[PDB]
């Protein structure tokens, strides 16, 4: 390929003896010696600056500092405690399906999004999960089963028009940590934890059919969903008559962190075996 090889035929052996760093890769380091850099050494003359003791950063020389005049105001207020939702465009989603990172074949949740490196979640930073925004709304062709943390109307509308099913789920911080990195969790050697219920402010969000929250009454799903089809003017596909209907139907227990696993089990990766307790108190604790 690289005609450089043919040049390498005629040249002497590469060794340690001849090695040249890229031109301008190293910038020469300057030292205060000689006529130019010596004699005040770029430090200026007397004053406070040549003794090196001049004041700290904000200091204005004694008039009231710029950063200390301005009144304070809630800006960064409670910034520790505001939930954060990593956005996911339908562009990005269509993209991940198209190049076949995520497969629409099996049900698509947060874990499989992480595994596709489509979205990076850091529970530790007060990040509560993925949200759905409508950027690829027109472009979007895929038939998908998605579970996000927060969704927008136009997003749900798009996924309907293509005949998929969206569902909103809430995870607490701990559950989210476990959900986003399942393997480093199993190597802890802890049981599989209970999933928390949403706190009080979020609860009104997850009981609505309009939202299609996981804690909502399924009975309203055939209603509100049809409503969405009127507004954006598409005909609603029949999910029951579909061939993949058994996958779309699949939900999680509100107390389950994982698909088909159960709260309280323990995964042993060495013997490739799952452990479940028979203890009455234990089983009551996890089953609740």
């Amino acid at each position: 390929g690289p005609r450089a090889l043919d040049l390498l035929r005629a040249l002497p052996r590469v060794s340690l003896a001849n090695l040249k760093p890229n031109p301008g890769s190293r910038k020469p380091e300057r030292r205060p010696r000689g006529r130019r850099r010596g004699r005040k050494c770029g430090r200026g003359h007397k004053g406070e600056r040549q003794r090196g003791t001049r004041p700290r950063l904000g200091f204005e020389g004694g008039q009231t500092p710029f950063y200390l005049r301005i009144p304070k105001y809630g800006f960064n207020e409670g910034h520790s405690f505001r939930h954060q939702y990593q956005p996911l465009s339908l562009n990005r989603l269509q993209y991940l399906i198209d190049l076949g990172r995520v497969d629409p074949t099996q049900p698509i949740d947060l874990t499989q999004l992480v595994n596709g490196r489509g979205v990076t979640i850091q529970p530790s930073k007060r990040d509560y999960g993925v949200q759905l925004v409508e950027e690829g709304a027109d472009t979007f062709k895929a038939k998908v089963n998605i579970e996000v943390q927060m969704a927008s109307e136009l997003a749900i509308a798009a996924i309907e028009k293509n005949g998929g099913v969206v569902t909103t789920a809430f995870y607490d911080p701990r559950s989210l940590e476990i959900l986003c990195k399942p393997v480093p969790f199993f190597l802890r050697g802890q049981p599989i934890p209970k999933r928390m219920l949403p706190p009080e402010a979020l609860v009104p969000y997850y009981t609505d059919a309009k939202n299609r929250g996981y804690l909502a009454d399924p009975a309203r799903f055939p209603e509100a969903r049809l409503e969405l089809a009127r507004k954006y003017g598409y005909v609603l596909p029949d999910i029951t008559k579909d061939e993949l209907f058994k996958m779309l139907s699949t939900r999680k227990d509100p107390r389950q962190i994982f698909f088909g696993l159960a709260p309280g089990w323990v995964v042993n990766m060495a013997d490739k075996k799952i452990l479940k307790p028979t203890d009455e108190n234990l089983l009551k604790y996890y089953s609740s």
Binding site: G1, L5, R9, V14, L19, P21, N22, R117
Partner: protein, 250 residues
């Protein structure tokens, strides 16, 4: 029968593989025992002396820990007192006689504490450095692929004469697939020499490749390297440490 080696990994559509003679180490005179197909990506990589340099230096410096300590003006033995009074003496004013100006005094700046130079090059840079080293070796004719590696005898004179008759150049490095699987005669004969050198394939590296004029690989070793190195074009960015369980990767 001539041993022919076909590549077990997909070549890029636009790129035909490279070929190298398969030599046997048993006969003085058996020069070409076979023909090996080598992967164009590992051995034919666009040659960069740049990355060779960067990794060559990295190898030298990441290990380095300097223990050179110099006692500062505070750590010297004694003399926490003023030698004479400020005014009236007629000589120049001083603090502790252990000041850096004084004859037995502390060193003003000097080397401080045990120092570690440690920096981790990004993986793909180290990998492509390794590739480039192999490529250079091959395109300068100073690489020789061997099969077997069984020696006819344990006498070191055999190995030296074998270097001479094949004109292998002054120093030689030999690379075997495993440490336990090394044949007896070779282990002995090589362990008796300075200019020749013997290493498992786990321990290939750039600095050593440049330190010996001639590299020699076992065939299962090529099958090994080609695989490990080629694996990094197609990989995802790591999620946790690769030692942990992944779907395809062990």
């Amino acid at each position: 029968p001539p041993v022919l080696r076909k590549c077990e990994l997909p070549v890029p559509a636009h790129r035909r593989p490279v070929q190298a003679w398969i030599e046997s180490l048993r006969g003085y005179e058996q020069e070409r025992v076979g023909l090996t197909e080598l992967h164009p990506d590992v051995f034919s990589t666009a040659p960069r002396l740049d990355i060779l340099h960067q990794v060559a230096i990295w190898q030298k410096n990441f290990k380095r820990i300097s223990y050179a300590k110099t006692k500062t003006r505070a750590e010297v033995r004694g003399g926490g007192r003023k030698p004479w009074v400020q005014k009236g003496s007629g000589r120049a004013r001083h603090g502790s006689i252990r000041s850096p100006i004084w004859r037995g005094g502390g060193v003003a700046h000097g080397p401080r504490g045990p120092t570690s130079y440690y920096y981790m090059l990004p993986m793909k840079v180290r990998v492509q450095g390794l590739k480039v080293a192999l490529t250079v070796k091959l395109a300068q004719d100073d690489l020789h692929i061997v099969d077997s590696l069984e020696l006819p005898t344990a006498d070191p004179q055999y190995l030296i004469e074998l270097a001479r008759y094949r004109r292998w150049g002054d120093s030689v490095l030999l690379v075997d697939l495993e440490h336990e699987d090394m044949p007896q005669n070779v282990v002995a004969a090589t362990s008796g020499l300075k200019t020749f050198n013997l290493v498992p394939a786990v321990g290939l590296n750039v600095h050593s490749m440049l330190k010996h004029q001639t590299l020699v690989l076992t065939l299962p070793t090529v099958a090994f390297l080609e695989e490990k190195l080629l694996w990094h074009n197609s990989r995802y960015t790591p999620l946790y440490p690769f030692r942990l369980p992944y779907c395809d990767f062990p």
